[PDB]
C-alpha cells in the first residue's frame, strides 16, 4: 500500500490522531 | 519539515509519530 | 500510537487515515 | 444547481452523512 | 469507482446513496 | 437518506453539503 | 430552531434544506 | 505573518469559529 | 464575494467577521 | 461492535485496522 | 470574536486557524 | 490547562493565541 498527502488542517487532525495525549508540535516554518 | 515530508511528499502514520511530544 | 475515543464522523475520519487506499467498511450496530 | 468535487476525507464524511446507520463501504481501488 | 464519480468528476448526494449498505 | 444527530461544526458541515453553491444561513438561537 | 433540534433531537436532510439560500 | 486559503467546507468551519452564536451567511454566488 | 476574498485570494479571521450576522 | 466500542469506551488504531479492506 | 467550546480534534482545528504559519504546540494534561 | 478549559468550560481565541509559536 502507498500513502497520500496530508495538508493543512488534515495534517494537524492526523497528528492529533497519532499523538493524542502525548501532545505534539506543528511547526510548518521548520 | 513536516509540511515537506507529509504534504508536499507523502508520509506514513509512523513518521507522524516523530512530531509527538 | 495511543488509544482513541472516537464518535460519529470522527471514527470515519480515523478509518480513512488508518486504511488509506485500502478502503474500509463502516458497519454501525442497528 | 450544480455539484462540487468531494475528495479524500471529505468524501467519506459525505458518505457518513448520507448513509449513517445503514453503514457504507469506501473502496477507492474499485 | 466512487473516486472517479465523486472526486475526479462530480456527483450528487443521491449518487452517494449507491455506496450505502 | 437517514436522520441525523448534528451538533456544533458538524451541523455547518451538513448544511454545506446539502446546500452546495446555493449557500445557506446559520442562525442559532441566542 | 434547526440548530437546536438537530443537536438535542434529530433532523433530516430535508429539514436542513430549508436553510439553503 | 501571512494568511492561507480557506476553501469549501474549511471556509464554513472558519466562519463557524469566528461567528459562533452570532450566526453567519455563506453565499458563494454573491 | 467570500470565495473570491478567502479562497481564491487569502483573508484574515478579522475579515471573516464581515459575514457574521 | 467497533463503532460502538470506540465511542462508549476506547479503541486502538490496531483494532480499527481490522475494518480496512 | 466569540467564546468557544472546543473538545477533541475541534480544539486542534481552532489552533490551526488561529496560529496559521506560526504553528502551535498542543499540550493536553495527562 | 487550555485543552481542558476549552472543553470543560469555554475559551476565547485570544487565549488560544498564546499556544502559537
Ligand atoms: Zn480539505
Ligand atoms: Zn465533533
UniProtKB/Swiss-Prot annotation, chains A, C, D, F, H, K:
Parts of the chain that traverse the membrane: none
Domain of life: Eukaryota
Organism field: Homo sapiens
Protein name (Swiss-Prot/TrEMBL): Insulin B chain
Gene from which this protein is expressed: INS
